[PDB]
Write an enzyme that holds these catalytic residues in place. Structure first.
Site, PDB file in Angstrom:
ATOM      1  CG  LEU C  38      23.924  -6.002 -22.296  1.00 19.65           C
ATOM      2  CD1 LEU C  38      24.663  -4.765 -22.430  1.00 19.65           C
ATOM      3  CD2 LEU C  38      24.805  -7.266 -21.932  1.00 19.65           C
ATOM      4  N   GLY C  40      19.031  -8.108 -17.965  1.00 16.68           N
ATOM      5  CA  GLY C  40      18.385  -8.904 -17.157  1.00 16.68           C
ATOM      6  C   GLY C  40      16.827  -8.882 -16.996  1.00 16.68           C
ATOM      7  CB  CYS C  42      14.604  -5.170 -14.075  1.00 16.33           C
ATOM      8  SG  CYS C  42      13.839  -3.562 -13.812  1.00 16.33           S
ATOM      9  N   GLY C 116      28.546 -17.832 -17.980  1.00 19.67           N
ATOM     10  CA  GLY C 116      29.702 -17.717 -17.031  1.00 19.67           C
ATOM     11  C   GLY C 116      29.895 -18.951 -15.945  1.00 19.67           C
ATOM     12  CB  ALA C 183      -3.343 -12.276  -4.875  1.00 15.40           C
ATOM     13  CD  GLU C 189       3.189  -4.188 -10.842  1.00 18.39           C
ATOM     14  OE1 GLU C 189       4.067  -4.563 -11.769  1.00 18.39           O
ATOM     15  OE2 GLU C 189       3.584  -3.257 -10.514  1.00 18.39           O
ATOM     16  CB  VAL C 240      -3.705 -24.064  -7.186  1.00 20.93           C
ATOM     17  CG1 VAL C 240      -3.870 -24.620  -8.563  1.00 20.93           C
ATOM     18  CG2 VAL C 240      -4.564 -22.660  -7.467  1.00 20.93           C
ATOM     19  N   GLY C 276       5.761 -17.044  -7.178  1.00 21.24           N
ATOM     20  CA  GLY C 276       7.115 -16.610  -6.700  1.00 21.24           C
ATOM     21  C   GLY C 276       8.186 -16.651  -7.439  1.00 21.24           C
ATOM     22  CG  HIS C 449      -2.492  24.284  -3.101  1.00 23.82           C
ATOM     23  ND1 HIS C 449      -3.033  23.488  -2.278  1.00 23.82           N
ATOM     24  CD2 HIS C 449      -3.305  25.121  -3.971  1.00 23.82           C
ATOM     25  CE1 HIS C 449      -4.428  23.658  -2.705  1.00 23.82           C
ATOM     26  NE2 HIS C 449      -4.712  24.734  -3.712  1.00 23.82           N
TER      27      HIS C 449
HETATM   28  C1  FAD Z   1       6.991  -9.377 -14.588  1.00 28.01           C
HETATM   29  C2  FAD Z   1       8.125  -8.804 -13.590  1.00 28.01           C
HETATM   30  C3  FAD Z   1       7.731  -7.433 -12.943  1.00 28.01           C
HETATM   31  C4  FAD Z   1       8.672  -6.842 -12.191  1.00 28.01           C
HETATM   32  N1  FAD Z   1       8.448  -5.563 -11.732  1.00 28.01           N
HETATM   33  C5  FAD Z   1       9.311  -5.097 -10.719  1.00 28.01           C
HETATM   34  C6  FAD Z   1       9.132  -3.546 -10.442  1.00 28.01           C
HETATM   35  O1  FAD Z   1       8.106  -3.024 -10.926  1.00 28.01           O
HETATM   36  N2  FAD Z   1      10.083  -3.001  -9.426  1.00 28.01           N
HETATM   37  C7  FAD Z   1      11.077  -3.814  -8.912  1.00 28.01           C
HETATM   38  O2  FAD Z   1      11.836  -3.243  -8.206  1.00 28.01           O
HETATM   39  N3  FAD Z   1      11.371  -4.998  -9.319  1.00 28.01           N
HETATM   40  C8  FAD Z   1      10.387  -5.703 -10.238  1.00 28.01           C
HETATM   41  N4  FAD Z   1      10.824  -6.831 -10.698  1.00 28.01           N
HETATM   42  C9  FAD Z   1      11.883  -7.614 -10.134  1.00 28.01           C
HETATM   43  C10 FAD Z   1      13.361  -7.103 -10.972  1.00 28.01           C
HETATM   44  O3  FAD Z   1      13.152  -7.552 -12.337  1.00 28.01           O
HETATM   45  C11 FAD Z   1      14.424  -7.909 -10.052  1.00 28.01           C
HETATM   46  O4  FAD Z   1      14.282  -7.603  -8.799  1.00 28.01           O
HETATM   47  C12 FAD Z   1      15.790  -7.695 -10.726  1.00 28.01           C
HETATM   48  O5  FAD Z   1      15.772  -7.806 -12.179  1.00 28.01           O
HETATM   49  C13 FAD Z   1      16.846  -8.235  -9.901  1.00 28.01           C
HETATM   50  O6  FAD Z   1      18.232  -7.648 -10.532  1.00 28.01           O
HETATM   51  P1  FAD Z   1      19.373  -8.742 -10.678  1.00 28.01           P
HETATM   52  O7  FAD Z   1      20.387  -7.900 -11.521  1.00 28.01           O
HETATM   53  O8  FAD Z   1      19.990  -9.272  -9.329  1.00 28.01           O
HETATM   54  O9  FAD Z   1      18.717 -10.100 -11.432  1.00 28.01           O
HETATM   55  P2  FAD Z   1      18.283 -10.512 -12.735  1.00 28.01           P
HETATM   56  O10 FAD Z   1      18.069  -9.083 -13.558  1.00 28.01           O
HETATM   57  O11 FAD Z   1      17.099 -11.505 -12.861  1.00 28.01           O
HETATM   58  O12 FAD Z   1      19.088 -11.157 -13.702  1.00 28.01           O
HETATM   59  C14 FAD Z   1      20.651 -10.694 -13.993  1.00 28.01           C
HETATM   60  C15 FAD Z   1      21.087 -11.551 -15.187  1.00 28.01           C
HETATM   61  O13 FAD Z   1      21.868 -12.557 -14.771  1.00 28.01           O
HETATM   62  C16 FAD Z   1      22.112 -13.331 -15.884  1.00 28.01           C
HETATM   63  N5  FAD Z   1      22.882 -14.683 -15.467  1.00 28.01           N
HETATM   64  C17 FAD Z   1      22.569 -15.590 -14.620  1.00 28.01           C
HETATM   65  N6  FAD Z   1      23.469 -16.371 -14.417  1.00 28.01           N
HETATM   66  C18 FAD Z   1      24.195 -16.330 -15.519  1.00 28.01           C
HETATM   67  C19 FAD Z   1      25.659 -17.015 -15.976  1.00 28.01           C
HETATM   68  N7  FAD Z   1      26.029 -18.161 -15.383  1.00 28.01           N
HETATM   69  N8  FAD Z   1      26.168 -16.364 -17.030  1.00 28.01           N
HETATM   70  C20 FAD Z   1      25.606 -15.211 -17.636  1.00 28.01           C
HETATM   71  N9  FAD Z   1      24.683 -14.565 -17.114  1.00 28.01           N
HETATM   72  C21 FAD Z   1      23.998 -15.070 -16.268  1.00 28.01           C
HETATM   73  C22 FAD Z   1      20.615 -13.467 -16.443  1.00 28.01           C
HETATM   74  O14 FAD Z   1      20.416 -14.008 -17.654  1.00 28.01           O
HETATM   75  C23 FAD Z   1      20.197 -12.043 -16.182  1.00 28.01           C
HETATM   76  O15 FAD Z   1      20.024 -11.264 -17.459  1.00 28.01           O
HETATM   77  C24 FAD Z   1       9.770  -7.607 -11.508  1.00 28.01           C
HETATM   78  C25 FAD Z   1      10.042  -9.096 -12.002  1.00 28.01           C
HETATM   79  C26 FAD Z   1       9.263  -9.447 -13.253  1.00 28.01           C
HETATM   80  C27 FAD Z   1       9.325 -11.081 -13.478  1.00 28.01           C
HETATM   81  C1  FAD Z   2      -5.565  31.602 -13.348  1.00 22.44           C
HETATM   82  C2  FAD Z   2      -4.804  31.429 -12.126  1.00 22.44           C
HETATM   83  C3  FAD Z   2      -3.944  30.150 -11.948  1.00 22.44           C
HETATM   84  C4  FAD Z   2      -3.208  30.026 -10.777  1.00 22.44           C
HETATM   85  N1  FAD Z   2      -2.425  28.748 -10.596  1.00 22.44           N
HETATM   86  C5  FAD Z   2      -1.787  28.514  -9.368  1.00 22.44           C
HETATM   87  C6  FAD Z   2      -0.932  27.331  -9.187  1.00 22.44           C
HETATM   88  O1  FAD Z   2      -1.264  26.455  -9.929  1.00 22.44           O
HETATM   89  N2  FAD Z   2      -0.365  27.225  -8.166  1.00 22.44           N
HETATM   90  C7  FAD Z   2      -0.145  28.071  -7.245  1.00 22.44           C
HETATM   91  O2  FAD Z   2       0.453  28.008  -6.221  1.00 22.44           O
HETATM   92  N3  FAD Z   2      -0.803  29.309  -7.341  1.00 22.44           N
HETATM   93  C8  FAD Z   2      -1.682  29.343  -8.694  1.00 22.44           C
HETATM   94  N4  FAD Z   2      -2.334  30.821  -8.711  1.00 22.44           N
HETATM   95  C9  FAD Z   2      -2.162  32.074  -7.608  1.00 22.44           C
HETATM   96  C10 FAD Z   2      -3.039  31.664  -6.354  1.00 22.44           C
HETATM   97  O3  FAD Z   2      -4.216  31.575  -6.779  1.00 22.44           O
HETATM   98  C11 FAD Z   2      -2.829  32.702  -5.305  1.00 22.44           C
HETATM   99  O4  FAD Z   2      -1.541  32.782  -4.815  1.00 22.44           O
HETATM  100  C12 FAD Z   2      -3.535  32.710  -3.895  1.00 22.44           C
HETATM  101  O5  FAD Z   2      -4.885  32.320  -4.202  1.00 22.44           O
HETATM  102  C13 FAD Z   2      -3.289  33.805  -3.080  1.00 22.44           C
HETATM  103  O6  FAD Z   2      -4.036  33.369  -1.786  1.00 22.44           O
HETATM  104  P1  FAD Z   2      -4.774  34.353  -1.044  1.00 22.44           P
HETATM  105  O7  FAD Z   2      -5.207  33.710   0.158  1.00 22.44           O
HETATM  106  O8  FAD Z   2      -3.674  35.256  -0.395  1.00 22.44           O
HETATM  107  O9  FAD Z   2      -5.620  35.403  -1.714  1.00 22.44           O
HETATM  108  P2  FAD Z   2      -7.137  35.200  -2.883  1.00 22.44           P
HETATM  109  O10 FAD Z   2      -7.169  33.712  -2.700  1.00 22.44           O
HETATM  110  O11 FAD Z   2      -6.639  35.881  -3.861  1.00 22.44           O
HETATM  111  O12 FAD Z   2      -7.903  35.649  -1.846  1.00 22.44           O
HETATM  112  C14 FAD Z   2      -8.645  35.404  -0.606  1.00 22.44           C
HETATM  113  C15 FAD Z   2     -10.046  35.765  -0.423  1.00 22.44           C
HETATM  114  O13 FAD Z   2     -10.015  37.357  -0.160  1.00 22.44           O
HETATM  115  C16 FAD Z   2     -11.323  37.544  -0.245  1.00 22.44           C
HETATM  116  N5  FAD Z   2     -11.352  39.192   0.143  1.00 22.44           N
HETATM  117  C17 FAD Z   2     -10.708  40.080  -0.292  1.00 22.44           C
HETATM  118  N6  FAD Z   2     -10.939  41.484   0.099  1.00 22.44           N
HETATM  119  C18 FAD Z   2     -12.236  41.185   0.998  1.00 22.44           C
HETATM  120  C19 FAD Z   2     -12.750  42.006   1.950  1.00 22.44           C
HETATM  121  N7  FAD Z   2     -12.764  43.139   2.099  1.00 22.44           N
HETATM  122  N8  FAD Z   2     -13.752  41.359   2.738  1.00 22.44           N
HETATM  123  C20 FAD Z   2     -13.900  39.961   2.761  1.00 22.44           C
HETATM  124  N9  FAD Z   2     -13.512  39.127   1.790  1.00 22.44           N
HETATM  125  C21 FAD Z   2     -12.464  39.652   1.052  1.00 22.44           C
HETATM  126  C22 FAD Z   2     -11.466  37.645  -1.836  1.00 22.44           C
HETATM  127  O14 FAD Z   2     -12.876  37.665  -2.199  1.00 22.44           O
HETATM  128  C23 FAD Z   2     -10.755  36.068  -1.497  1.00 22.44           C
HETATM  129  O15 FAD Z   2     -11.696  34.957  -1.831  1.00 22.44           O
HETATM  130  C24 FAD Z   2      -3.176  31.073  -9.674  1.00 22.44           C
HETATM  131  C25 FAD Z   2      -3.916  32.294 -10.051  1.00 22.44           C
HETATM  132  C26 FAD Z   2      -4.772  32.465 -11.045  1.00 22.44           C
HETATM  133  C27 FAD Z   2      -5.400  33.667 -11.286  1.00 22.44           C
END
Ligand code: FAD
Ligand code: FAD
Lengths: 43, 472, 471
Positions: C38, C40, C42, C116, C183, C189, C240, C276, C449
């Protein structure tokens, strides 16, 4: 349901969305609605 | 030789540099003061950036050195680690990004002042260079964004040699044979995993009974922990550290006990990483002589416009309440400056995502089950395992699941928790949905590309809404 | 001889999904499939196996090339065990096929194995290999027979030296040289997969851009430029004229400018033919029921996916619309829902497209060309991944995010991503479009962030406000 920004716009101009009508997908009060009130008020 | 401006920002981190830039783009004559040699602050210089780089490189090293690449037909002689070169890639990225902010400042005409900032008047700030050089700035507004620092552990002295903070851990000179991490919060787990992959025997010790810090869903935390342990990362939860001692051979003896007392033991390591937490930095900012008093946690109290007691002086980011996250600091810095120009300032903190960049990644936004239960909110649960998702199974990376929490009657999405492949990026689709007050139905309706990891998110939402998913 | 409410012919993306949702809505459901498994196209010879090879070949390239060395991951030698790489792919396919099976057992959707043929407005007959047959009486018949490879005139595919995507996915060795005809997405892909594994690859395309239909032109050209830098060669605006098998088993492919002239011959070891795909409706009984296919061989349906006979529905690859797996699945779901008495919509301007190469390419909504063509006035927001924190920390900076919004309503018209994470990132766009989001809306959504998605946030911001923060 105010959309973000629609909520921002309404707050900036102290307006209550009730005053208008939501014209957006699935009951949303959009940025357009918000602006229609800022206009249809400060008009 | 004073200078003047409309907005003077103290600190060039996520909050500060982003605020300075936006201020200028809004027309404000802007100045940004920074005491360190480079811009970007914590995140850029010793936080997010360096840690994500080592997480990326160590993950790849693990894939090549372990059984993963072999399972894909990529066969190699002997996989060797050149730690210094791995450190170099990290350093190169950081240097490029620091240079970038300097360039973004000149581009938006933001004036960069080098030195330690100190408010010396309600409309004045005095930057003092290391060499003594001074520079006065008279401003209409003052923006405090001084950020944070490492929270020291009582009785243990960090020296960045064998006892390190996250900063020292991001730059070790050799893989330590054994490492102990104090604190299993986001930063601890990330850095612990980095070194574990590179070959260190790693154990994280934590007072609480779960890893992943505050707010993480319990089921998520427990599943995450189980996976990390399967990877070889050890944990000692509900455990307190009572002290640490440097030894004759350079090693360190860390003494611990159960959090509730008892079960005393000693564990020896080559490197001790202390990361119990981080705290607001406001050293000699001049807040005292201005009447600005901190809260018990050391933060600067502010209103919804980020104004301190003195209305023309604001504060944002790590130096004020709320999640100490980079994106949180950026949002605040943005709306604060927009606020200075009459813009709205309401920011919903329930829509700030959290991300742990380990592998598997963990990311979440909204509320955990524990929080819903605490607030007595009735809810529905939607789960979908990555083992059932096509892209994940095709990639042979199937750990975790996506868990959706919906309001039992309004089918409104209350929480989204992701453990597994691409959690970090996926949580933003989740964030956007919450900002729109989406329902499980809304998401379930959207057509998601096949095959993609996001389909797990879509289907977990369908399972919440409709009660059943398609592929599980 | 059994009966049911809905009988689905074809177990691919549209078929098996439609079948499961039907039983999930109380319909007694049967699914018929001619193949031994089953899933299809995709699952068996499409999306899945190709993504597995793209994933594996990408990792092979990072290890074999300069990427890993730049990260301190040193290897004396790195070599390809193609059999093993192929095994990972097939292990994945086999696991997912058993999965559909189990899902049918679970949802009590009955599976009949055979070809079918619609023998009557309310009867379907399937015939097995041995010759046996199963009669199926149903009030409804859902045809999701999908597609097949479109053959090239004059060149016969043998799945040996001249293969279709199916053959390209199971090559037994890395060909020294390969020529790809077409293309488009599939060709790019598959050709990239082999180019990474060591093949000297060249794609020949009649049109003047790579990527298929609807892809933004600027996106398409930047993408091409990156692939060529990778070593993937292109012959665009080229036809082609023919191919000949040679004394040594190689193949001479003769080409010339599309408009005419400059004839040349290119010799290769494998010729991949993928100009296509087309709807498959062979011996279904439609020619007897009065179901007239449109010119392109597709079954004409209405908003409820109904054909001439209101109790007969067609979805997926057999009907118009992008021939994508998710498009097929969506239709199969809304169709079944409509059948149980439900509304049915589907704005094909919200169905995304992804190219799983590296850099990835993904988009949803309208391109710059569609807008100019439609006379829609718009504005452009672009953010290069070269300025995105995560992209840079990961040292994977190719590309950008380009956002298109109406000059006045600031509404998001289309999103195009070329770079890391595009495939997952486009789904954040699909959600945004389904809410009629404006660029400002997205820019005001808090993004973690550092994440690649910040590029999307910043692009929507540069388009909404005029400029981004980090670029
Ligand atoms: C290499 C490749 C990559 C793709 N990548 C993407 C992607 O990244 N993202 C995306 O959105 N789409 C992608 N597609 C397209 C996607 O696969 C199709 O849009 C999707 O399968 C359509 O779904 P469907 O159910 O209408 O038809 P299909 O899944 O093509 O077919 C449904 C089924 O009908 C059956 N069937 C047909 N006639 C009969 C019958 N008389 N009796 C019984 N069974 C029957 C078939 O055997 C099949 O299993 C890709 C396609 C290919 C070929
Ligand atoms: C290891 C680590 C990992 C983290 N990872 C994440 C994360 O993934 N996602 C997330 O959302 N948050 C994360 N945080 C928290 C995030 O860094 C803080 O919430 C953020 O920096 C707060 O921003 P702020 O501008 O208020 O202060 P800060 O960026 O702490 O400071 C602003 C500036 O004020 C300056 N300053 C202070 N006093 C004075 C002064 N008197 N004169 C001049 N300059 C001064 C400082 O020197 C500093 O450069 C992480 C923190 C740490 C420590």
């Amino acid at each position: 349901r105010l959309s973000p920004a629609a909520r921002n716009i309404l707050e900036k101009h102290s307006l209550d969305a009730s005053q208008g009508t939501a014209t957006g997908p699935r009951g949303i009060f959009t940025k357009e609605d918000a602006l229609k009130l800022v206009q249809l008020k400060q008009t | 030789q004073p200078i003047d401006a409309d907005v003077t920002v103290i600190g060039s981190g996520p909050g500060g540099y982003v605020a300075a830039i936006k201020a200028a783009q809004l027309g404000f004559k802007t100045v940004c003061i920074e005491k360190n040699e480079t811009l970007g602050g914590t995140c850029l210089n010793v936080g997010c950036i360096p840690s994500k780089a080592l997480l990326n490189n160590s993950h790849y090293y693990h894939m090549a050195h372990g059984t993963d690449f072999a399972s894909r037909g990529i066969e190699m002689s002997e996989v060797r680690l050149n730690l210094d070169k791995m450190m170099e890639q990290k350093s190169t990225a950081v240097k490029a990004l620091t240079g970038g902010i300097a360039h973004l400042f000149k581009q938006n005409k933001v004036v960069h002042v080098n030195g330690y900032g100190k408010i010396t008047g309600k409309n004045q700030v005095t930057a003092t260079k290391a060499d003594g050089g001074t520079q006065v700035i008279d401003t209409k507004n003052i923006l405090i964004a001084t950020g944070s620092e490492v929270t020291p552990f009582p009785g243990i002295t960090i020296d960045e040699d064998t006892i390190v903070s996250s900063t020292g851990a991001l730059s070790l000179k050799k893989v330590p044979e054994k490492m102990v991490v104090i604190g299993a919060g986001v930063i601890g787990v990330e850095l612990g995993s980095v070194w574990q992959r590179l070959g260190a025997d790693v154990t994280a010790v934590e007072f609480l009974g779960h890893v992943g810090g505050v707010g993480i869903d319990m089921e998520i935390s427990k599943n995450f922990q189980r996976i990390l342990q399967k990877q070889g990362f050890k944990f000692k939860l509900n455990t307190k550290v009572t002290g640490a001692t440097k030894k004759s051979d350079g090693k360190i003896d860390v003494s611990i006990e159960a959090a509730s007392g008892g079960k005393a033991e000693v564990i020896t390591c080559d490197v001790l990483l202390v990361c119990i937490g981080r705290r607001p930095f406001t050293k000699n900012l001049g807040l005292e002589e201005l009447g600005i008093e901190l809260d018990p946690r050391g933060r600067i109290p502010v209103n919804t416009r980020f104004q301190t007691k003195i209305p023309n002086i604001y504060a944002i980011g790590d130096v004020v309440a709320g999640p100490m996250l980079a994106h949180k600091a950026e949002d605040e810095g943005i709306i604060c400056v927009e606020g200075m120009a009459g813009g709205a300032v309401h920011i919903d903190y329930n829509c700030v995502p959290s991300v742990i960049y380990t592998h598997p990644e963990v990311a979440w936004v909204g509320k955990s089950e524990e929080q819903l239960k605490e607030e007595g909110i009735e809810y529905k649960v939607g789960k979908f395992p990555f083992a059932a998702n096509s892209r994940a199974k095709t990639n042979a990376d199937t750990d975790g699941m996506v868990k959706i929490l919906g309001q039992k009657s309004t089918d409104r999405v209350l929480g989204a928790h992701i453990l597994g492949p691409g959690a970090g990026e996926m949580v933003n689709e989740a964030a956007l949905a919450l900002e729109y007050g989406a329902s499980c139905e809304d998401i379930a309706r959207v057509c998601h590309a096949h095959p993609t990891l996001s389909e797990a998110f879509r289907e977990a939402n369908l399972a919440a809404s409709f009660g059943k998913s398609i592929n599980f």
